[model samples]
Target: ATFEIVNRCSYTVWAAASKGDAALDAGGRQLNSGESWTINVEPGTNGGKIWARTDCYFDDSGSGICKTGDCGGLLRCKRFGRPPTTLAEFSLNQYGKDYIDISNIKGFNVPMNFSPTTRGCRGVRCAADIVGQCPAKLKAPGGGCNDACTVFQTSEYCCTTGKCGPTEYSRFFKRLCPDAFSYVLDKPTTVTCPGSSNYRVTFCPT
Candidate 1:
């Protein structure tokens, strides 16, 4: 199946897809408004994620930084992108189906919509205007909103220790995007689709 990344935002966006140690679109191509990019993912490809990099400036050497979703200052990310990024995560062909979600657990840089292109599968998305109403403390220096865990780093916010539940901070995100993962222990966020389904991911879908 393939993942089609569509940029509906008015500005440029750099889309990334990484699985384990390999990063797809290693050259970090820029997608202008209304543009789209697609990558074929072989069956059984699991534990992969797609995200958007915003306000990026790279030199000819492919070295630079992104205001949001910077992945270790590299055009091709070998690891996960930094926080304040809206993520579309997937575990394909897992347990006979594809598991997918739009996670704001690390906070949101852009509004996103995720849908299966193939029939017989439901779609899920987090298309809220989170950046506009983000709380002051969780606001990123460049742009977007950071998750409580990313900002506070405490056991309470991160759920690193004992059992943890939603805090007022998590509630803030949940109210705006009930379908997304709002915290570390967020539940009912993931959805399943047919394993053979292709997906369409849109940034700034509104």
Candidate 2:
């Protein structure tokens, strides 16, 4: 996998990557401003998820309170991090094509750009002031924005079995990040890129 994680944020970012239920890069990595981590992803990774955490504090045993996107407060997050995290999901060599997408379904902590290096493939990005413009009702801890599904957990928002449509909160997220998956069952925003192409995940994209 030609995958790279770049931190263009002005502060520290703890990035996490996972494939299925297993953690890669020993769980997480730290990237200061202007830093990049060229991650090694195994072949045929299905629906791998990568994200960044903010305002974190960790100890020798890899334990701390990451204000946003904490996977049970373990630095090396074996599970997907907590909500209010901008997420990048990808599939490598699936059906002989690569699929790349990003979402704010959980929530948005920072602006992001997810792109493939392959030519002729469109990239997806969500670089907006979602946090500053977040409604008070959807405000989350540590400069994060919450989704209605996470805040209310209602049948209408969570959509246990029934079909769901865009709600008031969903509209807000969609308005800002039109390219992102705003809610569950929202139409597929995933874009297809050529197989064997590398990808880049940029945090705080300008």
Candidate 3:
């Protein structure tokens, strides 16, 4: 699955996350605002967290490991540390087709769950959960809205913040630089830096 980031405010965004809770603060990096990243997970796991950095800096998880408003924005899992039960298991078969080889658990196994009060957009309330403090970056490719582009736009636009749109650059970034920190504007027609931050960002996040 692919996850996207969107720039909610005019300012840039920084993101980072752990593939699993165990990986938290263990060996994860950070992201910049107005930038988007892509990650491939083991698939069929739960109880993970994604932290984000925006105008300030904070951790999305309520664990208080990160400071509040340290970055800018924040995102968390609904059940926070609660692994999701497998709803359906599948694998690509033939010429790009999903073949349900195994099915486990119950209910819809969407990347992220919503709160009961969540309404509109098919009950997807804020997609993920809120954390104790917003981190320096947020990374969760399988959750929320994922926009396919070289530049990541905010959910307010088309989901997937800090990603690009369809074009040569988008394809190039996915190919030559699957983990390159770059983005395209309007279309593949334009290119520019991800944000003011400087780091050797090779790939998105999990």
Candidate 4:
């Protein structure tokens, strides 16, 4: 399986991906507008995530911070990106199917489209202008909107204990992008397809 990351925004973006314990792919490359990069994802690479970082500055040694989607202040991410990042999550070849979703449970920084390049599979996308429309209280410092869990950090918002339901905050996100994950308890956002599919993940998908 493979993921082709495409940059369609007006400016440059640093795309990042993590799978299992392996090194990150395109951890801190300048993917300018109209450019694209593809990375091979080994089978059994379940619970992986891909996201884009914006307004980043790094030294030659690859040390810096991103205004949004910063991952441990390292160009090469050893961990997941910080909250307020739009996430493209996946579990490939699990239970005979490939599960995927666009998640805002951590919050939205950019619009994205996740589509299978293989035939006979459905495409999913989250293309809302979340940052421009973010509510005041949920706004982050640099850009993007913070999730209810990141703001309130309560059991109801975080769903840390068990099967909690959605709140007004989560509903806000869902209303914008119904197909993306709005809260921790939002399980129906995922889609499944036959395993070994190639996918295209586009940032700022039109």
- Local accuracy of candidate 1 as per-residue lDDT tens digits, 60-91: 87778998888878777766788899989888
**Model 4 C-alpha lDDT per residue in residues 1-206, reported as the tens digit of each score:** 88899999998888888753544565546689999999877786778888989999999989999988888887877678888889999999997789889999999998999999997678789998988888899999888899989988898999989879988888889999999989887858788878888899999998
Model 2: per-residue Cα lDDT over 1-206, one tens digit each: 76789999999999998864888656688889999988877777887889999999999989997888888888888888888889998888887888888998889997899998668698899999999999999998567998898899998788777788889999999999999999888888999888777888999989
- What does the lDDT read for residue 52 in candidate 4? 89
- TM-score of structure candidate 4: 0.95
**TM-scores, in order shown?**
0.95, 0.95, 0.27, 0.95
Q: Which pairs of residues have clashing backbones in candidate 2?
A: none
Q: Which consecutive 10 residues in model 3 have the weakest lDDT in total? A: 101-110
Query: Arrange candidates by lDDT, highest first: which order?
Result: 2, 4, 1, 3
TM-score, cand. 1 vs. native: 0.95
**Per-residue alpha-carbon lDDT of candidate 3 for residues 99-161, written as tens digits (9 for 90 to 100):** 221111111112221111112211111222211111213212222211222123343223246
Candidate 2: misplaced stretches above 4 Å? none
